[PDB]
Amino acid sequence: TNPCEKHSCIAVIDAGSTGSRLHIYSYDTDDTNTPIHIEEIWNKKIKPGFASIQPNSVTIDAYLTMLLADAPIHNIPVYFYATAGMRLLPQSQQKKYYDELDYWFRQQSQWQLVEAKTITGNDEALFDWLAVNYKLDTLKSVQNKSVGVMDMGGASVQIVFPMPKNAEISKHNQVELNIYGQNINLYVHSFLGLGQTEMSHQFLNSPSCFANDYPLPDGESGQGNAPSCKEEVTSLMNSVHKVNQQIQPLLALNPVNEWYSIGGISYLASSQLFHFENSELTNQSLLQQGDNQICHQQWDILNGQYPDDEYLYQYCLLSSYYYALMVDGYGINPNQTIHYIPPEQNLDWTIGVVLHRALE
């Protein structure tokens, strides 16, 4: 069956720093003119990130072909929204990618490209919050409790939580959201360069951040120690990006009742090396487990034991970095529960585009 003959469908592509994800969503619309019954009918994920590849015709064609060709329905509107991988590039370079992408869509007749563009980290943060709250079913009715969302990406990280309008804070970090007939005010922030790829490029020669005897590029050996690695990463969070000074005073005044994390942290928390129950973690436990299971283990043995985890070599660093970000940066308690969403649910920010077509 094609659901799109009886329900509205659109395609939304998350063109993220590490890869692109096509989603086709079916949905209906209610009397407030808001989508309801949003269902993902198709997903395809490819690597590497769109902004990583040579912006020539042959390369872009192979990539877009790989992403789209085998989709079960093509005669629908397409939203191509890139995030921090593209925001790392000069605007003149991004234009080369979008001109090639526009050309590609012009050479076929089925997909109807509505928009292709780089969205800001603040737009991405809004979509992050909408996507999680749609899955929680907390959008249709006014909530008594405060839901905070973090998106732990490769090139940027987002934090977003309810906060009344504040005249002392940049208009860019505040959004007023009207959805299902309710008004929601949110604080949004994205930290470009603090996603896990970009952050890691500052610590590749830090022995404390790699498993024992991991070969660092400078010829020294890993000698993992999560608390020590964490203190190194905290200097990038706070001395450089001032995460603490920006975020902590706001969260102190606008406490969050429930935290949800999406993005790459869900793959780490779900890996064989870790144990968490109920799809939730705490920072204390994530740092301890990373320390015990990776930082203080022998690299060759670990590499041979988990030959499928192409991210394994960074697990000591990532466990340390997530703690630095959430605890030292955002000021979240080490023993505070953080919910994460199984990666197999495909929950990125793209549901937020279905719900909310404007950009700020």
Added chain:
Amino acid sequence: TNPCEKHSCIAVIDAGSTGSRLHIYSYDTDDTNTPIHIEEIWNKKIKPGFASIQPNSVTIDAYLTMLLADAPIHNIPVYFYATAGMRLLPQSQQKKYYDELDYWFRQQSQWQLVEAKTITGNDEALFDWLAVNYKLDTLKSVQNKSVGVMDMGGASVQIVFPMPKNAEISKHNQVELNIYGQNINLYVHSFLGLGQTEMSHQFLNSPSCFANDYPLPDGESGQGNAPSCKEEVTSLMNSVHKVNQQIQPLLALNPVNEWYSIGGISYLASSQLFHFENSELTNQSLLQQGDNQICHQQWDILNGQYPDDEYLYQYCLLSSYYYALMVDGYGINPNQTIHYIPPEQNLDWTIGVVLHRAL
């Protein structure tokens, strides 16, 4: 017509983080078979960096074909040496690139691949110093003054200068070489992640680092202020990387009389926006000129005044960064002369390979 019929020839590829450069050099050798009379007989530069492309046989074949095919001579030894762009990747990912590259070279019968590898930052630094001193004609005789070299690349930066052999400092950052009958002892260091591209990814939403009204990725506006941007970059140099604690004590004990800078800084210093005499800058003058002529300008207007410069938008950040690195990191006096080499001279570290493989 045929420069390799009467001279030895070698190809050296700098597979750098932002692009690859094929050099073919002709040379003679002296009584010890050390190269002399090194002349660049071919240069070709392509983008992007090898370590950024998809590591499959079709992509790699196109990239190597673009880099190599039109070279005027092919039946010579080739070194393919990658630097910090490849160092950013774990060995498992690098292996995919070198296995494909090894296959591509086995498939043809003109080029004579000697080595394709990621060189260490310390070897890169050693080649940086040899290349510059070869061109200054300072290697033939024992210098009564210290020449220091900085290579300001895209993913790492190197610093290298004379330091007598000692038991105070780790053997890891000390190199000894014998060339043209003299013994030379150097301190070498490379800082991965502090090259310009990697550093810049931490400051793209910093208004102080861009011209007024430049559109930052987050939607805010540039509001350039080089001293402010410089203090931001300094926090990365010293609070995170501890450049100052690693380098300053050693330069205090081993002062450098003349500094030479290579890598991407030469393009910045050579641009139309800056006025330096005698192909030398000072850090204070670089910061002041970037502050006045880019940071404090209205971006749309400045971009229209200099419309053929795709790199201009980053000059407020880069002038701030270089001051942060050299002055706040290395401890160089802000008024000390730093020589730069005109970019048309194609002076990267590759002449160091020609020299060192014969030692």
